[PDB]
Design a protein around this nucleic acid. Sequence first.
RNA 1: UAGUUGGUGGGGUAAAGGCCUACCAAGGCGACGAUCUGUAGCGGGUCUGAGAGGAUGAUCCGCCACACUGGGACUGAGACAC
RNA 2: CAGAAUAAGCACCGGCUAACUCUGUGCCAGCAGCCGCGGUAAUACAGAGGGUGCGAGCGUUAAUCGGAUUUACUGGGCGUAAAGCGUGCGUAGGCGGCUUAUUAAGUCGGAUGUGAAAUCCCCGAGCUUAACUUGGGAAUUGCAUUCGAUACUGGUGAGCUAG
Lengths: 82, 79, 207, 155, 122, 130
Amino acid sequence: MVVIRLARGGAKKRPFYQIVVTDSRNARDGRFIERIGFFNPTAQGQAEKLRLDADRFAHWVSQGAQPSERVASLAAQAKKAT
Amino acid sequence: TVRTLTGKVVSDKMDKSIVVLIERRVQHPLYGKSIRRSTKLHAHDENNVAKIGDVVTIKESRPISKTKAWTLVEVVEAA
Amino acid sequence: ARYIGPKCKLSRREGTDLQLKSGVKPFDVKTKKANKAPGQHGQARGGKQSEYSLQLREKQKVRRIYGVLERQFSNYYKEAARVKGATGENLLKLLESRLDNVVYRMGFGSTRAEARQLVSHRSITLNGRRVNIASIQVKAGDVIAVHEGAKQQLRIKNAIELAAQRGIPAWIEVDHSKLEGTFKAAPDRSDLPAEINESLIVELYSK
Amino acid sequence: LVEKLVAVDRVAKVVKGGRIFSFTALTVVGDGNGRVGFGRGKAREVPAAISKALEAARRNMITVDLAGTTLQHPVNARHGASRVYMQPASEGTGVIAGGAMRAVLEAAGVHNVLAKCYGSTNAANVVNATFKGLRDMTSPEKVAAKRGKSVEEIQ
Amino acid sequence: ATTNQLIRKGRTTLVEKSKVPALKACPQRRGVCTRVYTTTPKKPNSAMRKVCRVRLTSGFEVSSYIGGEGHNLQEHSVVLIRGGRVKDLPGVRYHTVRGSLDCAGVKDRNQSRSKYGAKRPK
Amino acid sequence: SMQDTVADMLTRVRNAQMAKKQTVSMPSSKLKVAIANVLQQEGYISNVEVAQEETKSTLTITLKYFEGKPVIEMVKRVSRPGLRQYRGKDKLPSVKQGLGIAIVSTSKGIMTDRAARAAGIGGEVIAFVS
RNA sequence: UAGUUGGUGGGGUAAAGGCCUACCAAGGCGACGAUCUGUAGCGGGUCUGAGAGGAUGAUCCGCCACACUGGGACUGAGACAC
RNA sequence: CAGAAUAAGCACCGGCUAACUCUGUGCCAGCAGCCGCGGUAAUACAGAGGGUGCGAGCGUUAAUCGGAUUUACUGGGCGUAAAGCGUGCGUAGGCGGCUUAUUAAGUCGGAUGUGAAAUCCCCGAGCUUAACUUGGGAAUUGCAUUCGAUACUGGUGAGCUAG
């Protein structure tokens, strides 16, 4: 099915995740349909920690995408922050 | 909103089918001189209205046989 | 790597004083051999040179005064060429913006080698943290200070005493009581000595 | 006046009993701000050859009008089998040219230029070609005067 | 050429050939010493050059120069050869690496030891 | 045979300038008349005349000299029957940094490259004049 | 090049179609290179070059093909299945 | 916390190309990218002193592009240097005189859709700096559809005589 999950980027021991909408059968860092934000667990200074596009998130959820656990938690965090 | 082509019939021997020659003029990728390129398309003629030498128009469609995917729309000029 | 060994022979070969010595005694009395090259075939400055020789000798002088090796120097030249402006101007600003050079011109070091030793041993703090890399670029507005453990050090006292005799730069605002200074802007070409001819280095690397 | 020695060569003449050797020198002189010339000298030793070359160069002079410290427009020139191309450059470029072109350009006072030689790189012919190109390069005021228009009209 | 002639027939580029075909685009090769002998140079040089005939893993049969003063090579030795021409021994296009497999590094040298494969004296 | 009348016109003008004639005449056509009008407007020639004595028409051009040298020092055909050259508005060539002119045929008529760039259109590059 | 090119009736497929079959016709492709033969996974890209071009297709991403060598099908939404 | 305590090599010095002298040997031993050195005072062979260039690296070999306008589209040639078929006629093809009307294929302009991400470039951010990671742009010079222009080339109709 269609899922919303994190794709790992960055360097060794300093991960940086892209929040993507993709078919679940694809590889973690491979083919995807749409990128809708990012997550940086180790941000500091002027670096942004989390960015999510709520409109496209809701659109894909309505179409039937299934958010993962961490993405659901991040969406709750972003909604609280906004 | 359909793809149409205009050409000249070069054969009508086969049953319900015409061969139309399309001509286009393009620039040579390296030397820049305009050169003539041609292709042959098999089209579909239900009533054999087309003849050799006429200028016709065809449109794209679903396949009708092994090599035919175009259908005649109108005969602009008759030979 | 880093050059270690005889210092005065470099000045004798270059033909001028590159101030690797502290400066308590003049270069001429210190060497007794200036105006002659340090080889067994040492000669005077009146010998003929080629354009390639002039270009090479010009760049070597800057490298020896600033203590920079060839790979880092080529990287510096590439950066200066990429950045807008005059290439030699940018290169000189980049060389002057180094942390160890700033310490030397701020007076806590008698020589750039002493300043580099202090920076490496973490006796100097940038902003509010103990760095140990001498190639760090100091930016406008930065605050340089001596670690409280490194204070009341005889070499630092002697260094500031010699710096007082030396000319204080215009772009550095330094108080010697608490041993702290502020950088404000990159020195300009007129501020820098006119002996150095950056055009030769630019021609060399442009080849 | 800046004086530059482009090339010095030794030449031979055959006589009965052996050979007579001589020297030829080519020089370029220039004020550095729009006046330049070149010359050749022949003598049985180098100092005399050089002096004769400089004398001929100082006799053979022209005036060239630069645009600031660079050329006015791209130039193609040739003398014999040597061809030269020169092009204006922005400030900070320098003189990107071989030795023979560099002598003439620096003597004339150009500071930023890109140049290239095609064909034979014989020094005398290269210097000749660069000389003719610089001599024949034109200027907006001359173009406007010859056309009867104004400089702003020409653009 | 006319632009029409260029359209009809293009411009042809001739393919270059390697100067060291026995290497088969490898940096070095192994071989067995078929022969070890001495040859005379071309004019106007005069000496006794040390050469060896080697059968390579590539399958070819070549001749290689033995550099330096004095060598231990004999028949049936296994050696490593690289490119490099001698320019006065006709038909010799390869060099032998001193100190690699059975070749030994030359003795009594203290300048340019990395070539000739002599270890640093203690 | 004769297959490029524009090149013929340019060659006649160039040879007349090299031989120091005062006028040059040729058989006429509307394309050559347009090119001559552009040259006269740009100031390379003095006067353009067309004499229609019968079905045949003759074009006459008056040449200009300045300081003992011809005003037109270079004229070059660019597009030719064996290789036609077309350019967009962003690729119109500049002749010696704008001190010369390039003649361009556009859908709005024959004009200079400066005028074509001002109007934001392209076309066929006929000749370079300087 | 003779299921070869087109047509009709029938079969077959999730689906158009000589995909298959029985008849009818003599068509179809080719100097704008058919057929035959040698070499080769293709692209985003990488290196070089002032540019135009030249060389290349490791590591990352997309598509295709293969699973000791050849021929098949079954189960299943999906395979002719490391 | 203790103490300078644990830590520097490789190539080269005749010209191209920055950096020279002495011993040893004598067309031998040898060196060599090219030009070339060695046959008794070798700045070119071997060692030593001195020096130069790089530096945890330094040299050699292999391979691609460049220099090479040395396949030349940008951008070359054919009297004697390599290069005009022995000479005609002619098929496919390429190119083609002047005036006028029409068409809008070539040509040109606008709009829309598309040209995945990463990579290259720019302004920032985070790594003690840098490599590296990363936000947002610019670019992707292309392709397709549709709406316009008519100077030139092409098509069609009519007309003309300098070929």
